[PDB]
Design an enzyme around this catalytic site. Structure first.
Site, PDB file in Angstrom:
ATOM      1  N   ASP A 191      -3.602  48.004  20.650  1.00  0.00           N
ATOM      2  CA  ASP A 191      -4.058  46.817  21.341  1.00  0.00           C
ATOM      3  C   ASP A 191      -5.536  46.527  21.090  1.00  0.00           C
ATOM      4  O   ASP A 191      -6.077  46.898  20.058  1.00  0.00           O
ATOM      5  CB  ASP A 191      -3.785  47.008  22.847  1.00  0.00           C
TER       6      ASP A 191
ATOM      7  N   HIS B  15      -7.447  42.859  27.893  1.00  0.00           N
ATOM      8  CA  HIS B  15      -6.016  43.017  27.662  1.00  0.00           C
ATOM      9  C   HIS B  15      -5.589  44.501  27.706  1.00  0.00           C
ATOM     10  O   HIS B  15      -4.757  44.860  28.549  1.00  0.00           O
ATOM     11  CB  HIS B  15      -5.579  42.296  26.372  1.00  0.00           C
TER      12      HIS B  15
ATOM     13  N   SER C 199       3.574  41.434  27.659  1.00  0.00           N
ATOM     14  CA  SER C 199       2.796  42.660  27.437  1.00  0.00           C
ATOM     15  C   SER C 199       2.902  43.558  28.652  1.00  0.00           C
ATOM     16  O   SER C 199       3.154  44.744  28.502  1.00  0.00           O
ATOM     17  CB  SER C 199       1.324  42.335  27.228  1.00  0.00           C
TER      18      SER C 199
END
Ligand SMILES: [Ca+2]
Lengths: 355, 13, 14
Positions: free
Chosen positions: A103, A135, A295
């Site tokens: 990621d 994120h 996600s």
């Protein structure tokens, strides 16, 4: 013979960079020779080329920065299976298991994940056109967080494949999945869970690498994607032996993300909570933020799998998948949110831990 | 909203 | 005790 493929999503293509994939049992010496031959033949024609990487472990082949003019010649090289133009990818208990995360960069010193995440030295990110790690920190918190995590006992290894804007490349991701495979051969451990909370358009090469890693005994969990579309048109979501996770909300509804939302169809394995998910914010060391997406949904399943494999370490991928499906809440999702013909095809399953 | 602590989130929610 | 909806939904207890 050998074929050429490029992303069907025209704005997501990265021309001038190619993944030359060679036949299954091609050795690294043969691969390095094929790349040198390409540079030699191209030089003869006045073309400058640069070999960026040479794959081995999951997939044989190399990454070349060259003019697309050279593809007819490149397709005629020995051992070439297929060539793919590079494309973009975008951000979308459990103590016996190592959870790998490909990621954005992550804030490791966050009280929620401090000690649970090992930041590897891996970085392969495209140039950019607290924020860099928003994120990744949230997802790492969802998997193993101290207060808001699914598998608190799970340890994590983080790789950076998404830049500060949450953008990566197919090539970057391939090298990261190869890095995971290499790390395991050097220092074997127990069952491995690989979390891929990203998506691009259908990629033959990304799907191939995902299937090779899966056959090698690694468990791969991915986001179904946030394009309110069929997941079969996206990668790594379309790779069949991966656990492709869609997002549902508190009201048993598929998630709406702006004008879009969760992907659906015969490629999604099941759904999981992906709306209003409390988790670690990278704003401060003790910060928490609510986030949504496939996600987040995928991070839950990566946590449920990390726990199922720690309780039953000998489960095969096939057996783990049947356990995930067997323990899911059945027929609670509103199918009417999905396009009509996609309803019978979309699994009406919400991930859940064994009681 | 970004909560500065887990307690802040618990009082809010 | 409070438990976030998503952790309750997947079967976690508090
Ligand atoms: Ca699947």
């Amino acid at each position: 013979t050998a074929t050429f493929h490029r992303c069907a999503k025209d704005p997501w293509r990265l021309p001038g960079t190619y993944v030359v994939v060679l036949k299954e049992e091609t050795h690294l010496s043969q691969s390095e020779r094929t790349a040198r031959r390409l540079q030699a033949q191209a030089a003869r024609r006045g073309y400058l080329t640069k070999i960026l990487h040479v794959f081995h472990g999951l997939l044989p082949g190399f990454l070349v920065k060259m003019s697309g003019d050279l593809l007819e010649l490149a397709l005629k090289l020995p051992h070439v299976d297929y060539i793919e133009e590079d494309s973009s990818v975008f951000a979308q208990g459990g103590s016996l298991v190592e959870v790998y995360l490909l990621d954005t960069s992550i804030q490791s010193d966050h009280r929620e994940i401090e000690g649970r995440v090992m930041v590897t030295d891996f970085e392969n990110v495209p140039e950019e056109d607290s924020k860099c790690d928003s994120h990744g920190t949230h997802l790492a918190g969802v998997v193993s967080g101290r207060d808001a995590g699914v598998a608190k006992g799970a340890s994590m290894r983080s790789l950076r494949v998404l830049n500060c804007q949450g953008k990566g490349t197919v090539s970057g991701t391939l090298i990261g999945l190869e890095f995971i495979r290499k790390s395991q051969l050097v220092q074997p451990v127990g069952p491995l869970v690989v979390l891929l909370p990203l998506a691009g358009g259908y990629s033959r090469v990304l799907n191939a690498a995902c299937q090779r890693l899966a056959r090698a005994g690694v468990v791969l969990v991915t986001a179904a994607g946030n394009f309110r579309d069929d997941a079969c048109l996206y990668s790594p979501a379309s790779a069949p032996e991966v656990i492709t996770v869609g997002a549902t909300n508190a009201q048993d509804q598929p998630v709406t993300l702006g004008t879009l939302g969760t992907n659906f169809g015969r490629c999604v394995d099941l759904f999981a909570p992906g709306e209003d998910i409390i988790g670690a914010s990278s704003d401060c060391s003790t910060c928490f933020v609510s986030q949504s997406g496939t996600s987040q949904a995928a991070a839950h399943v990566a946590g449920i799998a990390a726990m199922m494999l720690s309780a039953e370490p000998e489960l095969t991928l096939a057996e783990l998948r049947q356990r995930l499906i067997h323990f899911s809440a059945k027929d609670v999702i509103n199918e009417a949110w999905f396009p009509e013909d996609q309803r019978v095809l979309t699994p009406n399953l919400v991930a859940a831990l064994p009681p | 909203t970004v909560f500065t602590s887990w307690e802040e989130y618990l009082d809010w929610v | 005790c409070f438990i976030p909806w998503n952790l309750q939904r997947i079967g976690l207890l508090c």
